Design an enzyme around this catalytic site. Structure first.
Site, PDB file in Angstrom:
ATOM      1  N   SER A   8       0.937  -1.036  -0.405  1.00 42.00           N
ATOM      2  CA  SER A   8      -0.408  -0.080  -0.058  1.00 42.00           C
ATOM      3  C   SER A   8       1.124   0.947   0.028  1.00 42.00           C
ATOM      4  O   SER A   8       2.156   1.142  -0.817  1.00 42.00           O
ATOM      5  CB  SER A   8      -0.792  -0.009   1.370  1.00 42.00           C
ATOM      6  OG  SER A   8      -1.820   1.109   1.167  1.00 42.00           O
TER       7      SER A   8
ATOM      8  N   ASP B 193       1.700  -4.152  -4.512  1.00 41.10           N
ATOM      9  CA  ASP B 193      -0.081  -3.737  -5.005  1.00 41.10           C
ATOM     10  C   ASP B 193       0.012  -2.545  -5.035  1.00 41.10           C
ATOM     11  O   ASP B 193      -0.777  -1.542  -4.680  1.00 41.10           O
ATOM     12  CB  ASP B 193      -1.413  -4.697  -5.221  1.00 41.10           C
ATOM     13  CG  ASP B 193      -2.255  -4.213  -5.683  1.00 41.10           C
ATOM     14  OD1 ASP B 193      -2.181  -4.699  -7.537  1.00 41.10           O
ATOM     15  OD2 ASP B 193      -2.812  -4.548  -5.531  1.00 41.10           O
TER      16      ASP B 193
ATOM     17  N   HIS C 253      -6.796  -5.846  -3.547  1.00 39.68           N
ATOM     18  CA  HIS C 253      -5.732  -5.510  -3.084  1.00 39.68           C
ATOM     19  C   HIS C 253      -5.938  -6.021  -1.580  1.00 39.68           C
ATOM     20  O   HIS C 253      -4.252  -5.534  -0.513  1.00 39.68           O
ATOM     21  CB  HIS C 253      -6.002  -3.880  -3.442  1.00 39.68           C
ATOM     22  CG  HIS C 253      -4.790  -2.623  -1.855  1.00 39.68           C
ATOM     23  ND1 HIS C 253      -3.549  -2.876  -2.924  1.00 39.68           N
ATOM     24  CD2 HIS C 253      -5.384  -2.065  -1.287  1.00 39.68           C
ATOM     25  CE1 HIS C 253      -2.602  -1.868  -2.320  1.00 39.68           C
ATOM     26  NE2 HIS C 253      -3.524  -0.874  -1.515  1.00 39.68           N
TER      27      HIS C 253
END
Lengths: 222, 230
Positions: free
Chosen positions: B79, B106, B206
């Site tokens: 993140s 991600d 995610h």
């Protein structure tokens, strides 16, 4: 068979054990990798010519099966050869062979019908290698055939093989009919910026610089 | 450090030798990586919290130099932590340290101020704290007493951040199983490194990548990244 089984392939660094199966740039001749081979001394290169027949993939798979019947395979491509290497990888994986990785030099995945042919043709306008009797005869037709194959090709699906891409030192904006190899593999997609413009990457002084990065790709393991 | 030199760090798998310096997700607490640590048993994780002060990069540099004085460094981010890891890597290489690789999960490089459309930092923060309302890592009065303030500070930092420059370190990126179109204010890490940029498709959305069964599968790929030699 007939005349010979090693038709459409040129072997370089023949006393080495690790093999790289290389597909040619758009001109269509594997001999164009002779200089690259001197920079990859620990690798045996089986450099293919472009096979014009419609069943070229079956022919390449047969040649590969004869040259390396067992073990993981390493493929390589530059220019239009990148797309051909991808198609050959799908063919080989579909036959049950394991393709460990495909190394690509500055070319992308064909996503639609609708280019570096003249640049490459200009580079070797007077190249001794492509002047031999064997080449001169079919050079015009082979380049035209590979060009025609590339422009109309639309690559779909994925390979399990990792894909390593050496990108040109110059900036480039991916066309609409082209795409990165990211979604083309379920394996790892790796890229590193190299040296020179597209048409000069595997020759001259830029070759020495780029060969170092190609060796980094090849000498990678997990 | 004051009365606690390790106030902004949580050490995991403490008996291990190889260290991974991990920057936290947008919520801001390194403890959120506890589950991940059990899937990377051969690595000692030094999981940072988001340092709210403006000199955070120097503080992270100081902590890393203290935790691993010599040898190549391996950083990790998930993140918003991906952005912090990149910024911290630049600081470290500037000090002469060798950053071997940065493993990103991600998240992409900030190229401009994030466009929140018709939303606000305030509402997004409330949401980010809802997606993880049930997470043992976020228990304890320690995290609960400052979770809001820290998440707000980290998200504000992320939204307004514009990262420039490059690192020499290789960058590995694990992408979520869910499709995604990189927005105008974000960019891939390709131009962010003079080394190699590697990416592999992972599993889950995610928010679920580093938890549950999804974590088990993704950890396998992270180990592939970590076990890479050339």
């Amino acid at each position: 068979g007939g005349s010979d089984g090693l038709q459409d392939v040129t072997i370089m660094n023949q006393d080495q054990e690790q093999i790289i199966f290389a597909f040619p740039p758009v001109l269509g001749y594997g001999l164009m990798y002779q200089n690259l081979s001197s920079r990859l001394p620990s690798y045996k290169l089986c450099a293919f010519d472009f096979i014009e027949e419609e069943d070229r993939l079956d022919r390449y798979a047969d040649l590969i099966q004869k040259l390396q019947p067992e073990g993981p395979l390493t493929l390589f491509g530059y220019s239009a050869g990148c797309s051909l290497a991808f198609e050959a990888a799908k063919k080989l994986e579909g036959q049950g062979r394991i393709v460990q990785r495909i190394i690509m030099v500055d070319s992308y995945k064909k996503q639609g019908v609708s280019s570096d042919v003249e640049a490459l043709m200009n580079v070797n306008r007077d190249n001794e290698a492509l002047n031999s009797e064997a080449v001169k005869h079919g050079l015009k037709q082979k380049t035209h055939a590979f060009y025609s194959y590339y422009v109309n090709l639309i690559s779909t699906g994925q390979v399990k093989a990792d894909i390593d891409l050496l990108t040109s030192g110059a900036d480039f904006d991916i066309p609409e009919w082209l795409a990165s190899w990211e979604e083309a593999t379920t394996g790892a997609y790796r890229m590193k910026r190299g040296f020179g413009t597209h048409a000069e990457m595997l020759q001259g002084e830029t070759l020495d610089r780029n060969a170092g990065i190609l060796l980094e790709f090849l000498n990678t393991q997990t």
